[PDB]
Amino acid sequence: MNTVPFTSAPIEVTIGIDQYSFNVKENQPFHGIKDIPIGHVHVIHFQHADNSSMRYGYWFDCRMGNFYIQYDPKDGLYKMMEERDGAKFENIVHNFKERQMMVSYPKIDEDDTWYNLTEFVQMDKIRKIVRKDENQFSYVDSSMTTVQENELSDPAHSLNYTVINFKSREAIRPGHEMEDFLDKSYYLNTVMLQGIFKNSSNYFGELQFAFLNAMFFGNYGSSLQWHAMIELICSSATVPKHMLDKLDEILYYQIKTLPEQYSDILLNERVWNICLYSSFQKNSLHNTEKIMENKYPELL
Amino acid sequence: GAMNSSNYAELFNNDIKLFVDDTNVYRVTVHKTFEGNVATKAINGCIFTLNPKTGHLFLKIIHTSVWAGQKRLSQLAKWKTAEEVSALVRSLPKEEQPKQIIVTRKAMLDPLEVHMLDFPNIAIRPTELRLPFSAAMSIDKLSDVVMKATEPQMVLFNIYDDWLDRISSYTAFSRLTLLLRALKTNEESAKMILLSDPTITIKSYHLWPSFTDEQWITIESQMRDLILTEYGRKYNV
């Protein structure tokens, strides 16, 4: 069980830790989050009470270092930082725990929700999509644009998702125009899985990371990436049976977790209708189709 | 984006462009089988690819053999169209390649965009105009070469004959669209109007009769009359 201490909470803020969130008052004696499960990535996220615009946050793995949050009154945000002095850190965390100034990561024993949303998500892959190599944690916010969005502007602050474009030379073999456009199996299996991702695990990792950025920060480019990666699988006639079974599970937990009130902006009608009702895989996503029909029948 | 009544003069500027119409690519007769089921028999088709400025028509004849053993033919027809247009562009010298291709039907946009990925600078555009290019097979000499083809063939025409010696492209295109609209609305009446006077013939190297400027005004008037009548009929107004 790991801990992310906070130096202080000088400004009133809603703090998210994975799928949980807590209101903190201006100068409330809040000193951080304890009992964070080892074995998963996590995201700690912020929305200021005075600016319900700019959701921002930090992807991290407590196995990779000792991390804390400290408010920067110049840049006006809660910043993640690494403490290199292990004994200073243990001594800080022990004091704050003794004085019970920390919220406990509120995991229910039965509850596999966070595992099910992050199954294939790896910190090493996050750090390649979000490039800032001097830190072991990754900053994301609502406004960060994707490499693909920038092509259609600051590259240092971009989300480097794998570019997927159904009307690109990458996606379409010369003399297989109709075949490759109507059945994307070539693009999915040779170009993306064998060629770029290397395996279905890294592909699912990026898909799950894109969803989480869309849900937790309302990052529009992440939403586009999540939908593109779903549509590429659904639009392929030939997909390994283990990938379809796993995609059904991944999507089920994503749809289960989505705030009911955000379905209008986070779910693309065309993609979901195509994927569940027209696509090659229309009959392969039983769990996902049942939860979508029972939870968002309007969208369909 | 889309081509409409607002940006009409763009057709007659000095940027090479082509209209593509796929409406006569896949043509069938529907018939009863011996068992009393229904079946189609494909007949020869054509891609209608037209430079509206020059009148140059690239009539790609689609022989029924291209459908043999193929499924989902109405879908294939769009892709075969896009493949043939793409092959035509690649066959043209660079300075003759179009800067824009306008498809008469929106279902051609994705097939043509995908076949033309090698030509990122050629704009693929839909149109809001309801162009009567489906009536191309009502031009006797175009119908004859399609129906006699025993193999895939490209035949080059000037759909304006020698009109550009006397009128602008704008006017030549308006004449062409009025003739085709008439042929589309009432073929028999339109063909009667065009050939009623046997003294006016079609030159061997032409599609339409050799009308004087005065005789085109009369013809053009008779085609507008034909079109308004049929409209009153269709709609009881």
UniProtKB/Swiss-Prot annotation, chain A:
Disulfide bonds: none annotated. Changing residue 236 to A: No effect on interaction with PRP8. It is found in: Cytoplasm; Nucleus. CDD domains: Aar2_C (cd13778), Aar2_N (cd13777). Residues 244-265 are annotated as: Leucine-zipper. InterPro entries: AAR2, AAR2_C, AAR2_C_sf, Aar2_N, AAR2_N_sf. It comes from the Eukaryota. Keywords: Cytoplasm, mRNA processing, mRNA splicing, Nucleus, Phosphoprotein. The modification Phosphoserine is found at residue 236. Pfam families: AAR2, AAR2_1st. GO terms for biological process: spliceosomal snRNP assembly; spliceosomal tri-snRNP complex assembly. GO terms for cellular component: cytoplasm; U5 snRNP. Phosphorylated on serine and tyrosine residues. The modification Phosphothreonine is found at residue 257. Component of the U5 snRNP complex that is required for spliceosome assembly and for pre-mRNA splicing. Involved in splicing pre-mRNA of the A1 cistron and other genes that are important for cell growth. Belongs to the AAR2 family. Heterodimer. Interacts with PRP8 (via RNase H homology domain and MPN domain), competing with BRR2 for the same binding site. Component of a U5 snRNP complex that contains at least the U5 snRNA, PRP8, SNU114, AAR2, SMB1, SMD1, SMD2, SMD3, SME1, SMX2 and SMX3, but is not a component of the U4/U6-U5 tri-snRNP complex. Present with 7330 molecules/cell in log phase SD medium. This is A1 cistron-splicing factor AAR2. It comes from Saccharomyces cerevisiae (strain ATCC 204508 / S288c) (Baker's yeast).
Curated annotation (Swiss-Prot), chain B:
Changing residue 104 to A: Reduced growth at 30 degrees Celsius. Strongly reduced growth at 16 degrees Celsius. Residues 7-237 are annotated as: RNase H homology domain. Changing residue 22 to N: Reduced growth at 30 degrees Celsius. Strongly reduced growth at 16 degrees Celsius. Changing residue 22 to A: Reduced growth at 30 degrees Celsius. Strongly reduced growth at 16 degrees Celsius. Strongly reduced growth at 35 degrees Celsius. Changing residue 21 to N: Reduced growth at 30 degrees Celsius. Strongly reduced growth at 16 degrees Celsius. It is found in: Nucleus. Component of the U4/U6-U5 tri-snRNP complex composed of the U4, U6 and U5 snRNAs and at least PRP3, PRP4, PRP6, PRP8, PRP18, PRP31, PRP38, SNU13, SNU23, SNU66, SNU114, SPP381, SMB1, SMD1, SMD2, SMD3, SMX2, SMX3, LSM2, LSM3, LSM4, LSM5, LSM6, LSM7, LSM8, BRR2 and DIB1. Functions as a scaffold that mediates the ordered assembly of spliceosomal proteins and snRNAs. Required for association of BRR2 with the spliceosomal U5 snRNP, and the subsequent assembly of the U4/U6-U5 tri-snRNP complex. Functions as a scaffold that positions spliceosomal U2, U5 and U6 snRNAs at splice sites on pre-mRNA substrates, so that splicing can occur. Interacts with both the 5' and the 3' splice site, as well as the branch region. Has a role in branch site-3' splice site selection. Associates with the branch site-3' splice 3'-exon region. Also has a role in cell cycle. The MPN (JAB/Mov34) domain has structural similarity with deubiquitinating enzymes, but lacks the residues that would bind the catalytic metal ion. Contains a region with structural similarity to reverse transcriptase, presenting the classical thumb, fingers and palm architecture, but lacks enzyme activity, since the essential metal-binding residues are not conserved. Present with 468 molecules/cell in log phase SD medium. This is Pre-mRNA-splicing factor 8. It comes from Saccharomyces cerevisiae (strain ATCC 204508 / S288c) (Baker's yeast). The gene is PRP8. The chain holds residues 1836 to 2069 of 2413 of the full protein.
